[PDB]
Design a protein around this ligand. Structure first.
Ligand code: HEC
Ligand code: HEC
Ligand code: ZN
Lengths: 136, 136
C-alpha cells in the first residue's frame, strides 16, 4: 500500500516546467524550479485516454539561485510522485501520493497516507486529479 | 551542409533548464525559459565519451508570464540545434548550427553557415563546444 520509488524517471518524458518564487502560496514546500515527467502509461492519460494502472507522474523540484537576473538550477529539494492503482489506492481516488526528500529512496515525506496531497489534487477531479497539460 | 529538423526531440532526454530574465546580458535574444534535450548519441558525449556523428543537442526557448510569484511557460520563441558531423561541419568545429523560428521546420534563421553561433560556442572548445553539463 506504499508508493514505489520511480527508478529511471529522469529518462522519462518531460511534460512541462514551472517556477514557483518566494511569495507564492505553494512556496512551502514547493518553491523552486520544477519539472514534470511521465512514463509511457501516464502519457496515454495526458493524451486523452484513461490513466491505466502503473501510470506514474513525477514532480522534480530544484532549488535555484538568482545570479544577474538568470535563474540557475541548484540542488534537488524533493520529488513528488503519483502512482496509478485504482484498487490499492482507492482511498485517495486511485492515485498513491508520496514524497522523497532530495529524490532519495530512503526519505519518505508523507505521514498521513496521502490525504494532504489528495485534498488539493481533488479540485482536478474533472481531469483525473492531474493539473499538468501536455503542451507541444 | 544543412542541419536537419530534429523530429521528436520533445521525447528525448531532458538535460537541464535555465531562465534568463530582463537585465541579464543575454535577454536579447535568449530571454525566457529554456530547456536542453539530447538524443542517445549526444548522451554518450555528455557522459564523458566522445560525440558520435549524428549526436544532436536542442535548445528549446519559451517566453514566460509572471503569474502571482510564478513564471509560467508561454509561446515557443524558437529552437536552436547542434548536429554533430566532423566532416560535413568541419567549418564550425564539427557541429552544424541552425535555428527554427517558433520551432517550425520552415523558419530557418541561420544565414552565415552558423559562424555567428560558433564564435560564442568556441569559448567552450575544451568541452567540444557544449556549455551544458549533465546533472542527476
Ligand atoms: C495544492 C495545495 C497542492 C498540494 C497540497 C499538492 N499539490 Fe501536487 N500539484 C499541485 C499543482 C498546482 C500542480 C501543478 C504544477 C504545474 O507545473 O502545473 C501539482 C502537480 C503535481 C504533480 C505532477 C502532476 C500534475 O498533477 O500536474 C505531482 C506528481 C504532484 N503534484 C504530487 C503531489 C504530492 C505527492 C503531494 C503531497 C505530498 C502534492 N502533490 C500536493 C497542487 C498541489
Ligand atoms: C553566446 C553569445 C551564444 C550564442 C551566440 C549562441 N549560443 Fe548557444 N549557448 C550559449 C550558452 C551559454 C548555452 C548554455 C545554456 C545553458 O542552459 O547552459 C548555449 C547552449 C546551446 C545549445 C544547447 C547545448 C549547449 O551547448 O549547452 C544549443 C543547441 C545551442 N546553444 C545552439 C545555438 C545556436 C544554433 C546558436 C546560433 C543560432 C547559438 N547557440 C548561439 C551561448 C550562445
Ligand atoms: Zn505578492
Amino acid at each position: 500500500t506504499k508508493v514505489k520509488y520511480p527508478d529511471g524517471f529522469r529518462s522519462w518524458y518531460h511534460v512541462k516546467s514551472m517556477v514557483i518564487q518566494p511569495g507564492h502560496p505553494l512556496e512551502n514546500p514547493f518553491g523552486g524550479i520544477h519539472h514534470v515527467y511521465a512514463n509511457a502509461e501516464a502519457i496515454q492519460g495526458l493524451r486523452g485516454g484513461n490513466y491505466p494502472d502503473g501510470a506514474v507522474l513525477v514532480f522534480d523540484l530544484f532549488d535555484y539561485q538568482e545570479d544577474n537576473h538568470a535563474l540557475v538550477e541548484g540542488k534537488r529539494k524533493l520529488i513528488g510522485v503519483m502512482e496509478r492503482d485504482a484498487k490499492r489506492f482507492s482511498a485517495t481516488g486511485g492515485w498513491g501520493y508520496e514524497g522523497f526528500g532530495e529524490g532519495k529512496p530512503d526519505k519518505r515525506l508523507v505521514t498521513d497516507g496521502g490525504q494532504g496531497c489528495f485534498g488539493c489534487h481533488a479540485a482536478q477531479k474533472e481531469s483525473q486529479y492531474v493539473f499538468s497539460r501536455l503542451r507541444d
